[PDB]
Ligand binder design. Structure first.
Ligand SMILES: [Mg+2]
Ligand SMILES: [Zn+2]
Lengths: 252, 53, 53, 194, 23, 32, 184, 11, 46, 194, 185, 178, 257, 35, 47
């Protein structure tokens, strides 16, 4: 039955609390839903939004309400993908990897649209892959690598120091449009800030963690001034072992 | 079994399927070597002339 | 096609010899390359490799 | 490969193994992976090269946390092993010298002295190489390079190398222009002149 | 485990076990 | 350069390096 | 070439301790570089024959991937099982390649097949990716190769070389497969 | 050195 | 690994082998730990 | 022998029932786990509680048994019980019994209050409350412990958290020796069967 | 228009021609020229420009980046998960095992010579029975241990022998020998 | 293999595709991307659309083609409008700057360079880039001539104050601070 | 929005370093701040050693809070933060002056110039709409005057990266539209309220920002402008400054002699 | 197996009744012939 | 031969902006459209 139930709604048990009116309204909505599904099926381009590995029907724990996250996923991001698709067709960039779109539109105007869109799509993707719903404890090997650089004579000081430096970098980005990354230069760790429409792959770093510092990201919940609280929460919900395994693959 | 023209045992072509240029060039394609590539465009689907009276 | 091949072989030839300005004690060629390859040979600058000159 | 049969003994030499190791050295992108290969080629007796010194010193002076002291140490050791310092190597040392003001002044002046010594020896060796060929223009350019790189270090070509130079000239113009060059080498550029 | 018997366990084990099987 | 040159040839590189370091040490507050 | 029979304890013991023959052949070829032996064309022949033991099996699969316009959707469990079974029957000699191929194209797919094909294809040539991912999948899940990659590599390589040939994906019916007279 | 070779580590 | 005696070889040289300690709280004879430790590791099991 | 083996294995290991897409694993046209898409989905998620690591963080180094005698005064609860339940909760990841939940609640209250301190209004909190009878953490919304899962089979969970080096190995050996061996030989010492 | 006719098949050939000049070295030149650029983006600019003029680079870094995005995007709405099989099939072309295979294939065609064999031989002799037992586990990698340099050769030169001097310390005499007709002279 | 395409269709979409290659290439440049709608089809659809509203052959064709072209016009207008913004963001580059990048790579190759020489070239190009001035003079002696140079940051300043030398040139209204 | 306080606290630490342009004074208008703080040369003023924003010891937005940095400030950082604050609230303020949808009275002269330039008022509506609509980022979009081609094209529309001011390019700002994503977000959530795709709601904000404009204000802007480029002292300052540039070319060319 | 289906151990494999009576044809043609 | 006769002139992208705004006016894009619709006509040349 899964196929036949429209995209948004949930399939559940009858409590028979339904008046006939809203019972008819529902079938109407379902009819229209079938219609807009038919048009979305043809409006589909080459690139598409990522499947989320975790249920977001409720918010992402300790971090987001349902509405915040869903305003990212199903509003800004889905738009970015619309633009990306619109401008990667009719051009030499048709039907290649996300990469070779990111990489061959780098550093230039007149492909500026395509590049911005592509790198945005990536940033979002990697952002979702960067959040593990109840949060993880950062693994020993990564803890060791991080200690050798940031740690000043304290136990796993590298963790509070990294989670400090990130806050700092986030607040030091004034535009409130962009991305904060923890990346591997190939010779060392560091925390970078990328403006909107730029990604770690265009600058050929290897990304470990992503943080969304777009204002749109924290505005529904933490308000205009609430960025510090936001980042602090992100570390309750971030995904460390990802960053770790990426790090180890970079090393060999 | 013979073709009519010169008596060939096969029907002539250069390419047949949509993917063969891609699938043949695959690691090039992931690499992004093929982006502006005009050889995989120009001749990708190119077929023989009709040599016939 | 061959025209193109030859044009771009002789061109970068003239940018191997024509890039020699600071090449005398320059980095552009290795010290060991100064050692081995700076001698006249069949691939470098033969006298003639053929009879009936 | 260690030879086994006489036929292989004829393909073998230490001086050539140098080339092989230099190749294997330019391959590695990081200093620490290089230090292993160098340790080996040092241990198994291998003739060591200008090339080896360039590819080692460059990628040592790049490496982020290197204590400048060790780069210089490494250089001297390579020289102890019979590698002939050249312009590239010395120049890398020049750059390495400029980037460390964090060292004590006695250190910086010691290594400065050594480096000036080095440039003058190189310029000498170079004039003596180029002299018999009647190369005058090229020679002159090389000398301009040496002069230039010495001035940044707050010195110049010593009188002696200038004597050796002047005696080998052919055109008159170059003679006088070289004397001129030597005098200007002493004074700053704003100095009173006729 | 912080008692004297344990302090004796570390210096000589065989006596410890022997008088554990007997005792 | 009299001293360290001798020591480098006579087998002591480290003493030679430190003595040259010490000579330039001297020269630094001789000249300035 | 008398194939041994399975027998009592010694033959099964010898099946057990057998180990990798493909690596053994290679060792024995290589060992001709030892000072006390020569380099043998026979040792190399034995190497070759163990590398290519399957060989033609791969060849067969090429044809199923590249020699058939519109072999349905090759991901669906149905056509997939057809392919699987026929492959395992080309290996182990239970069927001729010709018979297995003619089986494969005449295998049962779906009612009104052509008229459903008019809803996807113009001139009836499907896309070849599903076919190759399938034909590598079969050889992997069947135990065909000792080392896993070899299946995929050989199948891929053999296609890429033929890509440059005049009229690459058509074949004369008589020389395509096993028949009395053959190609050199 | 005896200790360094013989020691258990929790306390 | 050291020159310490396990409970194990003590048993081997007494000719006992693991069945005879039956009223003793020890289960694994090959560990290096005291009797009190052995008792605390198994405590939640009874 | 091989084919018979494969047949038996493929038959005993085959799945049945209905998957998340509503169909059997053997269904004709529609598929599950395409290109190890679920394997990766487990890779990057991981099976762990938030409660689990809050606890393992606060407790830190010190003895499990010690803490379990601490958290119980003589009259609180049987140590055997909460020891059992703790063992079954940490490894073999399970929902904690309301015994263990009450103990943990009055132990960890400051770390839970600190993890709950910044959260927005409509987002999931972390709360230990047994007000409802059942323990299955598919019941609470996963908000009881920090769990993202309804159920994880015990063995797999245990392999996962033990693949985390933080899980404490017995090390009845001399400590420093143990760590040295682990560093020098690596875990590749078991690559060898000899 | 700029360089005249300088052309190079790939990036490392350029880095061959300039000899000892790396990415970031130039990266500082471009980080000075375009002020607002980052330090990372400066090198990046160079690499992207070179890679446009020639083929893309072959590097473990770029490989990792590719893997990372491929798995950051995940499954796709393409019908057969088409671009995903594209992705995965391409990815395994750069695998260790695939390279081993390529070597064995080239081997079958007799593309080697004696020296490659003796190289393979001494690569074999270096293993213990234990090393074999550990590397027969993957059922491939031992073929890699043996064939490593042959593989590196397929997918990827001492000039003249320079000796030391043979001289009598005392008399300073050296001794050579010539011949013709094997006999007469 | 039999073309599902009836000869009329063949004539139509073939003719459409010969009038513009962009329309033909669009969906399939390299391999066929078959889960995306394609211009050739969309255009055929609205061609028949026109025909049954009684528009004739030629006019319907040029009209549909005009539709595609005006859509494309919108698209590439947006592209340029953003390209502008992104160039004055400073980290994006069109060809006239890339000529400077190729300039560097070419200069490095032509005269074989030492790392030292390179770091040098970097710092004096930093000086040029920032402190460098428009209106520079050469001495021909008596008579000395001044001309116009390349770009720099100081120049970029001077363009912001209207070459006046002062930050205050705007007499319009703004916020105030005391 | 209002930065008046943080700049009230920051400014006295900037003004002694600005005396090149002018020294300490009571009234400083944000425009002149922006332009004097606009393009920073790495070469002249670098990051002072132990720059607390460089090693990420302090965040850039917090340098206003602690006074140890206000004693010995790092000029490029201070400059950057001041630049951002001043430009941004110049924008907000400006929009509150342009955001008056009160009078629907449309001046004759404004039309007189606009139809000469665009060909109708609808054309200008459309310019503002598609320049605000399609943006590489959420910034501000400006309608400004430039003296350069001014006879030909008086006006143009520039959508500036983030909060960057157009004064920085030498253009005379006339009007402004706020597309900053605070506005997109609150627009989206004011739609689900009552008694959807991003592209079209963002453009809805574009074309309903245009209909709320006050044109009289733009008339006074444009008049102020033309008056200014008409002025004598403009020509004078130009002459005297370029005179300086010439003298400096001559002396820098004489120094090497 | 190791080689062709239409050629056995001793030569061409003799399918029609012409080859059982005239089995020169199995192995001979011309001067150029190999096994 | 070098002496007889005697490209890293730094070009900032922000100094160009006027020429960029020149192309966002639909005169020039009317132009590019006309230009590109002329050259889309199926060339038979190829080199
Ligand atoms: Mg004959
Ligand atoms: Zn600073």
């Amino acid at each position: 039955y899964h196929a036949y139930v429209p995209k948004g709604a949930s399939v559940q048990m009858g409590e028979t609390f339904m008046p006939s009116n809203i019972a008819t309204a529902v079938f109407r909505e379902t009819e229209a839903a079938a219609a807009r599904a038919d048009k979305t099926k043809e409006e589909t381009g080459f690139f598409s939004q990522p499947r989320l590995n975790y249920p977001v029907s409720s918010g992402i724990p300790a971090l987001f309400s349902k509405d915040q996250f869903d305003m990212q996923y199903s509003l800004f991001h889905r738009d970015v993908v619309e633009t990306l698709n619109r401008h990667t067709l009719g051009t030499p960039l048709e039907g290649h990897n996300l990469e070779t779109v990111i990489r061959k539109t780098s550093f230039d105007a007149t492909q500026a649209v395509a590049h911005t869109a592509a790198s945005e799509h990536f940033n979002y993707c990697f952002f979702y892959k960067s959040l593990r719903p109840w949060g993880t404890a950062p693994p020993p090997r990564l803890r060791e690598a991080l200690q050798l650089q940031y740690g000043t004579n304290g136990s796993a000081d590298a963790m509070d120091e990294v989670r400090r430096i990130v806050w700092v970098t986030a607040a030091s980005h004034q535009e409130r449009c962009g991305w904060v990354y923890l990346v591997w230069s190939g010779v060392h760790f560091d925390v970078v800030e990328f403006p909107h429409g730029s990604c770690p792959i265009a600058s050929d770093l290897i990304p470990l963690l992503a943080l969304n510092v777009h204002e749109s990201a924290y505005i529904l919940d933490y308000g205009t001034s609430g960025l510090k609280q936001y980042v602090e929460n992100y570390f309750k919900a971030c995904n460390w072992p990802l960053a770790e395994r990426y790090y180890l693959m970079a090393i060999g | 079994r013979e073709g009519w023209l010169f008596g060939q045992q096969v029907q002539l072509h250069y390419h047949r399927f949509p993917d063969e240029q891609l699938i043949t060039n695959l690691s090039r394609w992931r690499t992004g070597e093929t982006v502006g590539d005009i050889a995989m465009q120009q001749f990708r689907n190119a077929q023989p002339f009709d040599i016939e009276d | 096609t061959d025209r193109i091949r030859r044009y771009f072989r002789e061109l970068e030839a003239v940018h191997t010899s024509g890039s020699a300005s600071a090449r005398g004690s320059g980095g552009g060629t290795t010290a060991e390359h100064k050692q081995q390859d700076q001698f006249y040979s069949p691939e470098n600058q033969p006298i003639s490799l053929h009879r009936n000159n | 490969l260690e030879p086994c049969t006489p036929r292989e003994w004829l393909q073998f030499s230490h001086r050539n193994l140098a080339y092989a190791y230099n190749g294997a050295l330019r391959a590695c992108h990081s200093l620490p992976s290089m230090l292993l290969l160098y340790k080996e080629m040092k241990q198994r007796g291998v003739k060591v090269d200008v090339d080896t010194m360039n590819v080692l010193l460059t990628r040592a002076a790049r490496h982020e946390h290197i204590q400048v002291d060790d780069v210089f140490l490494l250089f001297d050791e390579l020289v102890a092993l019979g590698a002939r310092p050249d312009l590239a190597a010395a120049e890398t040392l020049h750059t390495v010298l400029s980037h460390s003001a964090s060292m004590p002044e006695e250190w910086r002046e010691a290594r400065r002295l050594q480096l000036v010594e080095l440039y003058n020896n190189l310029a000498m060796e170079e004039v003596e190489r180029l002299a018999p060929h009647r190369a005058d223009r090229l020679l002159k350019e090389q000398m301009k390079r040496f002069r230039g790189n010495l001035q940044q270090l707050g010195s110049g070509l010593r009188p002696t190398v200038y004597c050796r130079y002047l005696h080998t000239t052919h055109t008159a113009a170059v003679l006088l222009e070289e004397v001129h060059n030597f005098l200007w080498e002493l004074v700053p550029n704003d100095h009173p002149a006729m | 485990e912080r008692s004297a018997a344990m302090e004796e366990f570390r210096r000589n084990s065989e006596r410890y076990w022997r008088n554990i099987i007997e005792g | 350069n009299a001293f360290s040159n001798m020591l480098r040839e006579n087998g002591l590189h480290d003493t030679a390096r430190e003595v040259a370091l010490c000579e330039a040490m001297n020269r630094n507050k001789e000249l300035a | 070439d008398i194939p041994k029979n399975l027998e009592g304890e010694r033959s099964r013991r010898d099946l057990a301790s057998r180990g990798d023959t493909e690596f053994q052949a290679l060792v024995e070829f290589i060992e001709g570089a030892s000072y006390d032996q020569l380099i043998s064309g026979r040792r190399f022949k034995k190497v070759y024959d163990v590398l290519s033991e399957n060989d033609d099996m791969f060849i067969w699969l090429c044809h199923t991937a590249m020699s058939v316009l519109n072999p349905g959707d090759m991901r669906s469990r149905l056509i997939y099982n057809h392919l699987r079974i026929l492959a395992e029957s080309v290996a182990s000699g239970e069927m001729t390649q010709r018979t297995a191929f003619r089986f494969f194209e005449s295998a049962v797919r779906s009612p009104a097949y052509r008229e459903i094909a008019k809803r996807q294809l113009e001139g009836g040539a499907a896309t070849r990716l599903a076919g190759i991912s399938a034909a590598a999948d079969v050889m992997r899940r069947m135990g065909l190769t000792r080392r896993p990659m070899s299946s995929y590599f050989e199948l891929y390589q053999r296609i890429v070389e033929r890509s440059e040939a005049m009229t690459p994906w058509g074949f004369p019916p008589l020389f395509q497969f096993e028949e009395r007279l053959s190609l050199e | 050195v005896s200790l360094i070779l013989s020691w258990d580590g929790p306390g | 690994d050291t020159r310490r005696r396990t409970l194990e070889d003590v048993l081997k040289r007494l000719g006992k082998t693991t069945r005879d300690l039956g009223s003793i709280p020890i289960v694994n004879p090959r560990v290096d730990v005291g009797l009190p430790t052995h008792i605390k590791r198994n405590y939640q099991l009874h | 022998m091989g084919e018979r083996m494969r047949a038996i294995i493929e038959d005993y290991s085959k799945g049945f029932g209905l998957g998340p897409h509503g169909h059997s694993p053997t269904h004709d046209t529609i598929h599950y786990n395409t290109l190890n898409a679920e394997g990766e989905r487990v890779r990057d998620l991981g099976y762990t509680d938030a409660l689990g690591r809050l606890f393992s963080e606060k407790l830190g180094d010190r003895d499990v048994h010690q803490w379990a005698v601490e958290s119980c005064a003589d009259g609180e609860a049987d140590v055997r019980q909460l020891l059992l339940s703790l063992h079954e909760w940490r490894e073999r990841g399970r929902p904690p019994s309301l015994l263990l939940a009450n103990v943990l609640s009055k132990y960890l209250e400051e770390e839970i209050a600190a993890f709950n301190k910044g959260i927005p209004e409509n987002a999931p909190k972390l709360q230990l409350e047994t007000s409802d009878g059942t323990l299955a953490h598919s019941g609470s919304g996963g908000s009881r412990s920090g769990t993202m899962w309804a159920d994880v089979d015990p063995t797999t969970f245990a392999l996962h958290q033990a693949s985390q080096s933080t899980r404490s190995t017995r090390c009845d050996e001399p400590f420093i020796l143990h760590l040295v061996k682990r560093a020098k030989l690596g875990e590749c010492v078991t690559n060898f069967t000899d | 228009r700029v360089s005249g006719g300088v052309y190079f098949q790939s990036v490392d050939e350029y880095y061959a021609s300039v000899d000892g000049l790396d990415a970031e070295q130039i990266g500082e030149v471009l980080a000075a020229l375009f002020p607002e650029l980052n330090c990372y983006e400066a090198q990046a600019l160079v690499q992207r420009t070179l890679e446009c003029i020639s083929r893309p680079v072959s590097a473990a870094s770029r490989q990792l980046s590719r893997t990372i995005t491929a798995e950051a995007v995940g499954l796709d709405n393409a019908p057969g998960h088409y671009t995903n099989f594209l992705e995965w099939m391409g990815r395994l072309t750069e695998t260790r095992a695939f390279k081993t295979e390529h070597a064995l294939f080239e081997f079958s065609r007799r593309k080697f010579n004696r020296d490659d064999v003796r190289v393979m031989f001494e690569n074999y002799r270096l293993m213990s029975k234990a090393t074999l037992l550990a590397d027969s586990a993957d059922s491939y990698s031992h073929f890699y241990t043996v064939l490593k340099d042959f593989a590196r050769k397929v997918a990827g030169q001492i000039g003249v022998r320079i000796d030391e001097a043979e001289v009598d310390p005392e008399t300073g005499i050296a001794v050579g020998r010539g011949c013709a007709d094997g006999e007469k002279y | 293999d039999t073309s599902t395409l009836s000869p009329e269709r063949v004539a139509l979409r073939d003719e459409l595709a010969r009038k513009s290659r962009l329309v033909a290439s669009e969906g399939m440049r390299y391999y066929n991307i078959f889960w995306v709608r394609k211009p050739l089809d969309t255009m055929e659809k609205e061609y028949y659309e026109l025909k049954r509203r009684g528009v004739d052959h030629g006019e319907a064709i040029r009209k549909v083609l005009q539709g595609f072209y005006s859509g494309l016009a919108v698209k590439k207008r947006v592209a340029a409008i953003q390209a502008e913004e992104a160039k004055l963001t400073g980290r994006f580059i069109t060809m006239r700057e890339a000529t400077v990048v190729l300039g560097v790579l070419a200069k490095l190759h032509k005269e074989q360079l030492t790392p030292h020489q390179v770091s040098l070239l970097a710092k004096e190009q930093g000086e040029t880039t920032q402190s460098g001035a428009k209106l520079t003079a050469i001495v021909s002696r008596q008579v000395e001539v001044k001309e116009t140079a390349n770009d720099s940051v100081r120049q970029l300043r001077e363009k912001a104050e209207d070459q006046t030398g002062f930050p205050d040139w705007y007499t319009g209204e703004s916020p105030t601070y005391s | 929005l209002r930065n008046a306080r943080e700049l009230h606290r920051l400014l006295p630490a900037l003004l002694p370093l600005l005396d090149p342009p002018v020294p300490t004074g009571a009234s400083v208008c944000a425009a002149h701040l922006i332009v004097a703080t606009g393009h920073v040369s790495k070469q002249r003023e670098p990051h002072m050693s132990n720059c607390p924003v460089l090693e990420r010891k302090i965040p850039l937005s917090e340098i206003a809070s602690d006074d140890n940095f206000l004693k010995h400030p790092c000029v490029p950082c201070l400059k950057h933060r001041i630049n951002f604050l001043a430009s941004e609230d110049f924008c907000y303020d400006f929009v509150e002056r342009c955001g008056c949808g009160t009078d629907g009275a449309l001046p004759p002269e404004w039309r007189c110039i606009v139809e000469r330039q665009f060909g109708s008022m609808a054309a200008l509506v459309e310019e503002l709409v598609i320049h605000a609509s399609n943006r590489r980022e959420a910034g501000w979009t400006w309608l400004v005057y430039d003296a350069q081609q001014a006879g030909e094209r008086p006006l143009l529309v520039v959508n500036m990266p983030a909060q960057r001011s157009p004064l920085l390019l030498g253009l005379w700002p006339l009007a402004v539209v706020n597309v900053t994503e605070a506005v997109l977000v609150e627009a989206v959530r004011a739609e689900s309220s009552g008694s959807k795709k991003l592209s079209e709601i963002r453009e809805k904000v574009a074309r309903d920002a245009v209909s709320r404009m006050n044109w009289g204000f733009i008339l006074q802007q444009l008049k102020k402008a033309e008056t200014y480029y008409a002025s004598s002292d403009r020509g004078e300052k130009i002459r005297v400054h370029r005179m300086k540039l010439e003298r400096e070319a001559v002396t820098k060319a004489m120094s090497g002699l | 197996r190791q080689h062709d289906s239409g050629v056995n151990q001793y030569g061409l494999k003799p399918t029609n009744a012409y080859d059982y009576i005239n089995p020169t044809n199995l192995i001979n043609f011309g001067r150029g012939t190999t096994f | 031969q070098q002496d007889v006769d005697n490209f890293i002139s730094p070009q900032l992208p922000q100094m160009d902006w006027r020429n960029m705004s020149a192309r966002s006016s639909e005169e020039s894009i009317r132009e590019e459209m006309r230009q590109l619709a002329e050259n889309d006509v199926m060339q038979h040349q190829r080199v």
